[PDB]
Amino acid sequence: LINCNTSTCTQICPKVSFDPIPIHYCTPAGYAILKCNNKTFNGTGPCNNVST
Amino acid sequence: PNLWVTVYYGVPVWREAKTTLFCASDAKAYDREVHNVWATHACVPTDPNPQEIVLENVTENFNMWKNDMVDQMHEDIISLWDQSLKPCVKLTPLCVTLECTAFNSSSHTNAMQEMKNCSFNMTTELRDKKKKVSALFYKLDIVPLNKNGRQYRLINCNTSTCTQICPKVSFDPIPIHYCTPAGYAILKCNNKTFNGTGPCNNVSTVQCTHGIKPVVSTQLLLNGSLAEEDIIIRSENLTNNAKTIIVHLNESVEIVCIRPNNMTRKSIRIGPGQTFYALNDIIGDIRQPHCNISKEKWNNTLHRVWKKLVEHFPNKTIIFFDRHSGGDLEITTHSFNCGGEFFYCNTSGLFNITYNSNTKVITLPCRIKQIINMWQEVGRCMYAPPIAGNITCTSNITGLLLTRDGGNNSTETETFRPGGGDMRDNWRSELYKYKVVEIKPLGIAPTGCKRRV
Amino acid sequence: SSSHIAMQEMKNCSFNMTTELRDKKKKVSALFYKLDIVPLNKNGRQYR
Amino acid sequence: LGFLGAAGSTMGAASNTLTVQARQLLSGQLGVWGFKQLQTRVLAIERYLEVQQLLGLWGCSGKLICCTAVPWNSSWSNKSETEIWNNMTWMQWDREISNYTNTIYRLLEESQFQQEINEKDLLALD
Amino acid sequence: FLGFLGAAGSTMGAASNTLTVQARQLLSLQLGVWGFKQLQTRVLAIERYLEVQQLLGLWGCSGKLICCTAVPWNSSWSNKSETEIWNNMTWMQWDREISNYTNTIYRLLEESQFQQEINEKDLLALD
Amino acid sequence: FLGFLGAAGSTMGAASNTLTVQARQLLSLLQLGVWGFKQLQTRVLAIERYLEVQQLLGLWGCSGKLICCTAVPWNSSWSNKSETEIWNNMTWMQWDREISNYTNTIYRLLEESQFQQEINEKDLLALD
Numbered sequence: 001l002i003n004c005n006t007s008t009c010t011q012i013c014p015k016v017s018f019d020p021i022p023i024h025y026c027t028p029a030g031y032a033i034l035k036c037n038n039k040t041f042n043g044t045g046p047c048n049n050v051s052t
Numbered sequence: 053p054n055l056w057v058t059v060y061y062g063v064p065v066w067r068e069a070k071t072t073l074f075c076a077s078d079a080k081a082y083d084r085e086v087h088n089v090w091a092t093h094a095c096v097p098t099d100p101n102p103q104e105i106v107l108e109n110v111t112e113n114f115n116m117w118k119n120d121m122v123d124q125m126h127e128d129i130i131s132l133w134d135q136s137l138k139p140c141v142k143l144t145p146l147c148v149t150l151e152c153t154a155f156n157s158s159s160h161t162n163a164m165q166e167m168k169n170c171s172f173n174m175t176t177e178l179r180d181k182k183k184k185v186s187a188l189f190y191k192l193d194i195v196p197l198n199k200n201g202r203q204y205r206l207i208n209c210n211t212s213t214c215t216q217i218c219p220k221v222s223f224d225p226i227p228i229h230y231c232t233p234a235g236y237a238i239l240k241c242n243n244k245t246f247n248g249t250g251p252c253n254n255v256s257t258v259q260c261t262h263g264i265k266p267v268v269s270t271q272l273l274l275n276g277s278l279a280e281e282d283i284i285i286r287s288e289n290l291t292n293n294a295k296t297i298i299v300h301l302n303e304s305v306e307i308v309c310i311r312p313n314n315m316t317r318k319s320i321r322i323g324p325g326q327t328f329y330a331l332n333d334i335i336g337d338i339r340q341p342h343c344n345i346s347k348e349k350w351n352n353t354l355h356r357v358w359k360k361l362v363e364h365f366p367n368k369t370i371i372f373f374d375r376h377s378g379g380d381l382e383i384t385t386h387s388f389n390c391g392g393e394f395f396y397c398n399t400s401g402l403f404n405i406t407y408n409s410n411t412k413v414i415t416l417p418c419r420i421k422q423i424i425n426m427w428q429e430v431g432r433c434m435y436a437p438p439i440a441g442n443i444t445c446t447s448n449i450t451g452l453l454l455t456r457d458g459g460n461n462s463t464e465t466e467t468f469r470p471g472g473g474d475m476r477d478n479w480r481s482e483l484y485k486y487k488v489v490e491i492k493p494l495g496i497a498p499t500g501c502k503r504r505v
Numbered sequence: 506s507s508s509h510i511a512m513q514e515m516k517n518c519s520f521n522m523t524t525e526l527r528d529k530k531k532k533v534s535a536l537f538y539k540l541d542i543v544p545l546n547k548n549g550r551q552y553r
Numbered sequence: 554l555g556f557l558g559a560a561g562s563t564m565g566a567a568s569n570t571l572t573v574q575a576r577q578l579l580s581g582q583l584g585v586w587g588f589k590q591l592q593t594r595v596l597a598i599e600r601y602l603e604v605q606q607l608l609g610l611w612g613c614s615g616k617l618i619c620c621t622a623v624p625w626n627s628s629w630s631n632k633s634e635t636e637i638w639n640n641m642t643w644m645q646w647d648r649e650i651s652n653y654t655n656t657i658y659r660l661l662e663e664s665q666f667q668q669e670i671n672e673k674d675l676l677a678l679d
Numbered sequence: 680f681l682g683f684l685g686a687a688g689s690t691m692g693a694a695s696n697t698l699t700v701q702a703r704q705l706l707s708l709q710l711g712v713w714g715f716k717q718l719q720t721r722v723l724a725i726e727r728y729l730e731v732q733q734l735l736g737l738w739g740c741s742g743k744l745i746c747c748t749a750v751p752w753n754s755s756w757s758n759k760s761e762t763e764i765w766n767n768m769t770w771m772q773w774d775r776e777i778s779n780y781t782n783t784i785y786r787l788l789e790e791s792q793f794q795q796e797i798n799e800k801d802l803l804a805l806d
Numbered sequence: 807f808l809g810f811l812g813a814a815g816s817t818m819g820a821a822s823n824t825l826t827v828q829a830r831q832l833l834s835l836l837q838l839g840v841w842g843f844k845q846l847q848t849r850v851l852a853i854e855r856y857l858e859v860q861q862l863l864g865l866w867g868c869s870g871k872l873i874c875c876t877a878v879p880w881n882s883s884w885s886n887k888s889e890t891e892i893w894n895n896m897t898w899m900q901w902d903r904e905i906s907n908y909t910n911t912i913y914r915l916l917e918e919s920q921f922q923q924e925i926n927e928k929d930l931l932a933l934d
């Protein structure tokens with residue numbers, strides 16, 4: 001096996017599913033998330049349209 | 053005339069209590085060096101200019117021997133070691149029969165009996181194949197299997213499975229400060245001549261203790277704090293022979309320990325991604341490791357200790373002996389950790405001096421070990437990997453640990469043997485001036501004020 | 506060994522096991538209840 | 554003056570610096586250090602909350618110095634105000650009145666509850 | 680003296696005289712199962728206590744067992760007279776009756792307290 | 807009805823009318839592994855933040871009050887800006903940016919004013 005001089009492989013549990021399901025990240029109390037709604041935002045710099 | 057109860061929040065009153073403290077280390081310890089057992093970014097940065105508030109006209113009772121924050125420190129140190137040794141390689145495959153022979157180098161032909169050349173079969177990455185590997189082992193870490201003297205085994209194979217200390221992780225002690233949570237305070241006894249118990253006239257308060265290096269050693273406290281005025285002898289009960297005597301020196305005695313051999317390391321693949329670092333041949337001429345102590349300084353220090361001991365033991369002859377050479381190496385020799393290698397030095401030449409009422413250097417022969425069963429716990433062993441090149445350390449002897457022998461029928465003479473178990477005494481010698489108190493800010497006192505209806 | 510339920514309830518058993526060193530097997534023996542051992546083959550000599 | 558700086562001072566001097574104690578009452582990573590930090594933080598939070606709950610139950614909520622309507626029983630301490638207030642310290646008073654603390658706490662709770670009922674009734678009459 | 684929750688079967692007015700015991704009782708190890716269990720139970724109890732205290736502070740009733748407010752009672756919530764409410768039913772029955780309008784009353788209390796606060800602020804600014 | 811942080815870009819006067827939603831939102835099982843420990847650590851941190859703010863408000867004498875007027879005079883050194891423009895032209899962020907230098911001194915001043923008020927009130931009650 002290709003892994004046997006590197007590390008011990010672990011079989012994925014056959015009954016365990018791992019297809020990507022949607023996940024939302026939520027801040028605790030006292031913190032807020034700012035979402036930039038500027039449709040032409042390039043990911044850096046100021047953002048005119050902001051939401052919480 | 054008619055007084056009424058009044059409630060004050062923030063009253064400066066306290067009470068003895070036991071709590072849990074957290075660690076704080078110097079900010080310099082966070083500069084990379086994640087490879088560290090004690091303070092691998094798991095301690096909050098130390099508060100600059102620590103605030104010590106001197107409490108006036110206050111007398112408090114301390115007790116170094118019934119003190120908390122020492123057992124907790126011991127537990128924290130043990131847990132830190134276990135956590136740092138969790139990801140390290142477990143030497144389960146190494147418990148195998150070794151074919152050991154006394155290795156014979158060119159210099160050996162010219163203390164070469166301290167090591168043996170052991171060859172054994174080691175399982176490769178494939179479970180159905182074995183490879184005859186070789187390594188060099190100290191004679192202190194192998195025991196014979198038969199009486200034929202050909203086949204040996206690692207000393208720990210009947211006790212537990214040693215864990216190779218991760219070569220990257222550095223167990224060099226660094227100053228650790230102990231801090232109480234909110235609502236608690238530390239009372240520091242500033243009385244310079246405080247003997248460890250009883251009332252303390254000069255008391256102050258702090259949030260974090262001073263930098264305490266968690267140095268583990270026997271028979272000699274290393275890299276510790278020093279007394280301010282005179283040597284202080286501390287014991288829970290001097291007339292009790294079973295209580296170890298902690299001697300605190302106001303002047304440090306420099307000790308220089310060296311391992312001058314040029315060892316070579318080799319890697320043995322014992323599994324998938326598992327490497328075991330062993331000892332190869334020795335390069336160049338061999339010289340026994342040893343420690344150096346100035347003879348005049350140590351003689352003066354031992355004379356002062358003898359004077360204090362005869363002060364505490366008026367009508368008796370105070371004589372210093374060496375610990376019997378039949379017990380465990382941890383208790384019969386001054387053991388410590390220098391540069392990643394564990395030394396066990398014979399201090400028979402230190403406490404060999406006797407005193408009457410009327411440039412030379414002491415050299416202590418030391419022996420290195422690789423399989424270390426610390427904390428005096430059977431079942432918790434490790435393997436310290438070899439370190440290439442020579443190793444040198446320069447520690448400060450800031451204290452001693454003595455033990456008065458049992459009073460024999462032939463009285464009028466007391467013999468003090470260095471050593472004494474209960475490794476917590478190393479921490480106790482540092483946390484003698486600290487106690488933990490719980491603040492009780494709510495107070496009620498009569499006053500001539502009545503709340504409006 | 507019974508004087509004579511509790512006669513057949515137990516079995517002598519001899520086997521090999523690893524020692525403290527994982528390269529040598531030592532022949533040991535013990536007494537096992539017949540409720541803890543299952544025959545391997547049909548000849549009634551090897552159990553597990 | 555710093556935290557607990559008036560520990561050895563008299564009552565009147567110490568009562569002028571309750572604020573530093575009050576503020577230090579709430580001063581302010583899986584493994585052992587993180588777990589211990591979290592456990593100690595929870596315990597400190599608990600102590601602070603019990604103290605605040607007691608102060609609220611006594612009607613002294615949000616106040617460091619609070620006069621109450623509970624009369625001072627002479628049986629608790631017959632010494633007059635000036636001696637205890639300009640002679641002794643808080644530790645000594647605490648050790649003296651340590652026997653009677655629960656009774657005074659219970660009396661304060663009852664007094665506050667009775668005042669609350671009386672105020673509610675007085676507002677109801679209007 | 681009556682114990683914790685001892686006035687559960689008593690009428691409203693009779694049970695209103697034992698709030699201190701319940702209020703006091705609201706805030707009465709290692710990595711093992713029980714150390715962790717005590718840990719999350721204590722954290723959760725702290726969270727609930729803080730939530731209730733926050734509600735009381737938002738209503739202006741902070742630190743008060745019995746707190747009069749300025750919100751006028753609405754017959755839609757309940758049209759029973761005070762005397763039968765406080766001498767007939769218990770707190771459990773009243774809570775069961777009122778559970779429909781509890782959120783509305785809470786919102787009204789918050790708005791009333793904020794209105795009173797800004798009234799007092801501008802009144803003090805006038806002086 | 808304006809939502810949480812709805813008046814972030816509004817002026818101070820308009821934003822001060824919606825403090826209830828923010829105050830409510832400031833304090834709006836888990837396995838034994840790393841994940842649950844981290845989540846409950848965040849819970850503890852939020853509790854500490856809430857308690858710290860509440861303690862500061864109580865020390866200033868404004869416990870239980872969103873808007874509280876105090877007796878500390880406002881130094882012109884901290885700011886000289888006129889009032890109608892600071893309350894109808896500036897948002898909270900810009901104000902915080904200007905006063906980030908002097909917040910701590912104002913905190914101590916508010917606390918000392920409250921403590922002195924308490925001492926004088928106790929003395930006045932004792933006089934009666």
Ligand SMILES: *[C@@H]1O[C@H](CO)[C@@H](O[C@@H]2O[C@H](CO)[C@@H](O[C@@H]3O[C@H](CO[C@H]4O[C@H](CO)[C@@H](O)[C@H](O)[C@@H]4O)[C@@H](O)[C@H](O[C@H]4O[C@H](CO)[C@@H](O)[C@H](O)[C@@H]4O[C@H]4O[C@H](CO)[C@@H](O)[C@H](O)[C@@H]4O)[C@@H]3O)[C@H](O)[C@H]2NC(C)=O)[C@H](O)[C@H]1NC(C)=O
Binds near residue numbers: 225267275388390447
């Ligand atoms: C009582 O207190 C004394 C004084 O603190 C203490 O002695 C000190 O011991 C430490 C630990 O051994 C010493 O630090 C080591 O020293 C050497 C040499 O470095 C020194 O000198 C150079 C030149 O000035 C300085 O740049 C340097 O800062 C030191 O002063 C090295 O062996 C060590 O570096 C290696 O080990 C570190 C582990 O902490 C690693 O972080 C570091 O990266 C190095 O490891 C790497 O290189 C190795 C060599 O190639 C290699 O084998 C490793 O795998 C890895 O790649 C380290 O700096 C310190 O100097 C000592 N101080 C004095 C004054 O002597 C005593 O030990 C103490 N007593 C007891 C009983 O604890």
Ligand SMILES: *[C@@H]1O[C@H](CO)[C@@H](O[C@@H]2O[C@H](CO)[C@@H](O[C@@H]3O[C@H](CO[C@H]4O[C@H](CO)[C@@H](O)[C@H](O)[C@@H]4O)[C@@H](O)[C@H](O[C@H]4O[C@H](CO)[C@@H](O)[C@H](O)[C@@H]4O)[C@@H]3O)[C@H](O)[C@H]2NC(C)=O)[C@H](O)[C@H]1NC(C)=O
Binds near residue numbers: 519520521532
């Ligand atoms: C615990 O571990 C030990 C050590 O491994 C086991 O002991 C071994 O058991 C096996 C199986 O019983 C023994 O093998 C038998 O040995 C006997 C001698 O055979 C040898 O010599 C003949 C030539 O005369 C060779 O052909 C043979 O390979 C051996 O070298 C005989 O009893 C058996 O061989 C005869 O029977 C078999 C089939 O039954 C035929 O194939 C053979 O040709 C021949 O007719 C058999 O070989 C072995 O010797 C033991 N080892 C030692 C060191 O004594 C234990 O069994 C094991 N378990 C327990 C529960 O103790």
Ligand SMILES: *[C@@H]1O[C@H](CO)[C@@H](O[C@@H]2O[C@H](CO)[C@@H](O[C@@H]3O[C@H](CO)[C@@H](O)[C@H](O[C@H]4O[C@H](CO)[C@@H](O)[C@H](O)[C@@H]4O)[C@@H]3O)[C@H](O)[C@H]2NC(C)=O)[C@H](O)[C@H]1NC(C)=O
Binds near residue numbers: 155156170184332
């Ligand atoms: C500790 O003992 C071990 C053995 O238990 C020993 O390791 C051995 O080293 C020798 C020499 O390096 C290895 O020899 C190998 O095998 C054959 C032997 O003839 C040759 O192909 C090679 O030997 C070379 O060097 C010889 C000189 O020593 C020459 O004569 C020869 O022509 C070759 O150049 C090759 O190295 C031997 O296999 C190992 N054994 C094991 C098990 O690895 C080790 O040196 C000893 N250590 C000390 C410090 O004494």
Ligand SMILES: *[C@@H]1O[C@H](CO)[C@@H](O[C@@H]2O[C@H](CO)[C@@H](O[C@@H]3O[C@H](CO)[C@@H](O)[C@H](O[C@H]4O[C@H](CO)[C@@H](O)[C@H](O)[C@@H]4O)[C@@H]3O)[C@H](O)[C@H]2NC(C)=O)[C@H](O)[C@H]1NC(C)=O
Binds near residue numbers: 376377385399400
């Ligand atoms: C630290 O080093 C010291 C020495 O610096 C060391 O003590 C030495 O111990 C060895 C044994 O380990 C002693 O040597 C011999 O030991 C045995 C004891 O049974 C005997 O062979 C000898 O004792 C005889 O001594 C007389 C010989 O003239 C006889 O008359 C007598 O009957 C005995 O049979 C001999 O002692 C060695 O003497 C001591 N050295 C000293 C100075 O005491 C010590 O063990 C080391 N400590 C540790 C912890 O390693």
Ligand SMILES: *[C@@H]1O[C@H](CO)[C@@H](O[C@@H]2O[C@H](CO)[C@@H](O[C@@H]3O[C@H](CO)[C@@H](O)[C@H](O)[C@@H]3O)[C@H](O)[C@H]2NC(C)=O)[C@H](O)[C@H]1NC(C)=O
Binds near residue numbers: 037038049050
């Ligand atoms: C700034 O960003 C906000 C937030 O994303 C934008 O508001 C969003 O505007 C879109 C388009 O009008 C809305 O979608 C529409 O909503 C309703 C149903 O929800 C309906 O009219 C349509 O079917 C469509 O889906 C969206 O809901 C709305 N989001 C919010 C939170 O209100 C806003 O338009 C952006 N401003 C500028 C100038 O780009």
Ligand SMILES: *[C@@H]1O[C@H](CO)[C@@H](O[C@@H]2O[C@H](CO)[C@@H](O[C@@H]3O[C@H](CO)[C@@H](O)[C@H](O)[C@@H]3O)[C@H](O)[C@H]2NC(C)=O)[C@H](O)[C@H]1NC(C)=O
Binds near residue numbers: 256
């Ligand atoms: C009671 O204990 C306190 C606390 O340890 C002692 O106060 C300490 O006094 C020493 C000696 O004066 C101070 O060290 C010196 O201080 C100044 C600078 O601060 C300077 O002269 C020197 O450089 C030196 O550092 C020390 O700072 C001071 N500590 C504190 C916390 O105030 C006090 O002297 C003791 N009293 C008695 C009667 O023993």
Ligand SMILES: *[C@@H]1O[C@H](CO)[C@@H](O[C@@H]2O[C@H](CO)[C@@H](O[C@@H]3O[C@H](CO)[C@@H](O)[C@H](O)[C@@H]3O)[C@H](O)[C@H]2NC(C)=O)[C@H](O)[C@H]1NC(C)=O
Binds near residue numbers: 250285286288290
């Ligand atoms: C450290 O110093 C303290 C004092 O600061 C020493 O405590 C003293 O201990 C002695 C005995 O060693 C006590 O004397 C005995 O006390 C009782 C009551 O009288 C009784 O057992 C005997 O009759 C005898 O008198 C002494 O009272 C005690 N002093 C105080 C103030 O508690 C302590 O022993 C010293 N420790 C060391 C290691 O030197």
Ligand SMILES: *[C@@H]1O[C@H](CO)[C@@H](O[C@@H]2O[C@H](CO)[C@@H](O[C@@H]3O[C@H](CO)[C@@H](O)[C@H](O)[C@@H]3O)[C@H](O)[C@H]2NC(C)=O)[C@H](O)[C@H]1NC(C)=O
Binds near residue numbers: 289291292
């Ligand atoms: C410090 O250690 C010494 C030595 O162990 C303690 O003195 C010993 O105290 C025990 C009792 O705690 C004595 O046993 C009793 O003695 C008499 C007869 O001798 C009698 O009361 C009882 O039948 C019992 O045997 C013991 O004799 C005594 N030993 C010596 C050598 O004095 C001492 O109490 C310890 N000090 C403290 C403060 O703990």
Ligand SMILES: *[C@@H]1O[C@H](CO)[C@@H](O[C@@H]2O[C@H](CO)[C@@H](O[C@@H]3O[C@H](CO)[C@@H](O)[C@H](O)[C@@H]3O)[C@H](O)[C@H]2NC(C)=O)[C@H](O)[C@H]1NC(C)=O
Binds near residue numbers: 304446447448
């Ligand atoms: C073993 O003990 C010796 C002697 O006490 C220690 O050397 C002393 O270390 C201190 C702390 O670093 C030195 O004080 C500092 O020195 C310089 C200025 O000289 C500066 O960093 C600070 O202002 C402070 O004064 C002290 O001078 C030094 N004494 C001598 C004689 O060298 C040593 O650190 C101890 N530990 C070892 C060797 O591991």
Ligand SMILES: *[C@@H]1O[C@H](CO)[C@@H](O[C@@H]2O[C@H](CO)[C@@H](O)[C@H](O)[C@H]2NC(C)=O)[C@H](O)[C@H]1NC(C)=O
Binds near residue numbers: 046
């Ligand atoms: C989203 O943000 C971008 C980037 O700031 C805005 O693009 C600007 O558009 C104006 C008007 O055309 C130009 O003068 C600027 O030069 C643009 N900026 C850049 C960096 O290219 C864009 O207008 C924003 N979108 C909305 C809807 O407001």
Ligand SMILES: *[C@@H]1O[C@H](CO)[C@@H](O[C@@H]2O[C@H](CO)[C@@H](O)[C@H](O)[C@H]2NC(C)=O)[C@H](O)[C@H]1NC(C)=O
Binds near residue numbers: 245251254
């Ligand atoms: C530190 O504490 C010691 C021990 O209590 C004090 O020593 C006392 O000194 C007085 C005055 O000389 C003597 O009357 C006592 O008998 C001593 N006690 C003992 C047990 O010997 C010392 O004074 C204290 N020092 C400081 C600076 O506070």
Ligand SMILES: *[C@@H]1O[C@H](CO)[C@@H](O[C@@H]2O[C@H](CO)[C@@H](O)[C@H](O)[C@H]2NC(C)=O)[C@H](O)[C@H]1NC(C)=O
Binds near residue numbers: 407410
């Ligand atoms: C160790 O130091 C002691 C004193 O600390 C030295 O012995 C003393 O020497 C002085 C000076 O000659 C004499 O007055 C004393 O009577 C001596 N005391 C004893 C007990 O002999 C001693 O010489 C030093 N060296 C050694 C090896 O002990």
Ligand SMILES: *[C@@H]1O[C@H](CO)[C@@H](O[C@@H]2O[C@H](CO)[C@@H](O)[C@H](O)[C@H]2NC(C)=O)[C@H](O)[C@H]1NC(C)=O
Binds near residue numbers: 685687
């Ligand atoms: C349980 O119910 C009984 C019966 O109603 C209560 O006893 C009554 O108490 C009131 C108030 O003091 C009296 O006026 C009645 O005369 C009592 N009735 C009887 C039949 O004795 C009792 O107090 C209730 N207990 C609780 C704990 O609520």
Ligand SMILES: *[C@@H]1O[C@H](CO)[C@@H](O[C@@H]2O[C@H](CO)[C@@H](O)[C@H](O)[C@H]2NC(C)=O)[C@H](O)[C@H]1NC(C)=O
Binds near residue numbers: 754755756
């Ligand atoms: C008492 O509650 C009722 C029921 O909620 C309220 O009636 C509402 O009044 C508003 C405003 O006119 C209407 O939009 C709703 O449709 C009504 N609800 C129903 C169910 O009819 C009434 O306003 C409340 N009275 C007071 C004084 O607060």
Ligand SMILES: *[C@@H]1O[C@H](CO)[C@@H](O)[C@H](O)[C@H]1NC(C)=O
Binds near residue numbers: 156160161
């Ligand atoms: C090493 O081997 C040589 C050559 O066989 C021998 O003479 C010498 O005694 C040996 N040295 C030892 C065993 O120390």
Ligand SMILES: *[C@@H]1O[C@H](CO)[C@@H](O)[C@H](O)[C@H]1NC(C)=O
Binds near residue numbers: 314316441442
């Ligand atoms: C040890 O020997 C190696 C060669 O094996 C050499 O490069 C190195 O410098 C030596 N180390 C010391 C400390 O002399």
